[PDB]
């Protein structure tokens with residue numbers, strides 16, 4: 001069902017949170033080789049999450065689940081903010097700009113946390 005597909009999408013999201021937190025520790029410790037690998041892994045996870053989310057929104061639309069569509073439109077917009085900040089973080093890493101990396105890292109944490117009440121709201125609406 002779309003609800004089990006959203007639970008699968010939620011788990012992939014949690015996997016990104018887990019990897020993100022081990023990447024943050026690695027960054028703080030200066031282990032740039034680990035950071036590079038974690039950033040690649042996070043890219044894959046975010047790409048996968050985004051794909052699952054679009055499939056869930058499209059299905060909600062085909063099902064005429066207006067409330068779910070509203071919430072998913074808001075959530076996917078927030079997800080794109082996160083993606084843009086993530087890509088800026090990756091660029092800051094490439095450039096060796098640790099001050100920008102620190103900034104972007106904090107911002108991505110705030111975007112992800114704020115989206116969680118909505119994320120929980122979607123689970124109930126599908």
Ligand SMILES: Oc1ccc2c(c1)OCO2
Pocket residue numbers: 013016046049078079080081082083111112113114115116119
């Ligand atoms: O990759 C993400 C970017 C922004 C988010 C998110 C995941 O869940 C809540 O908001």
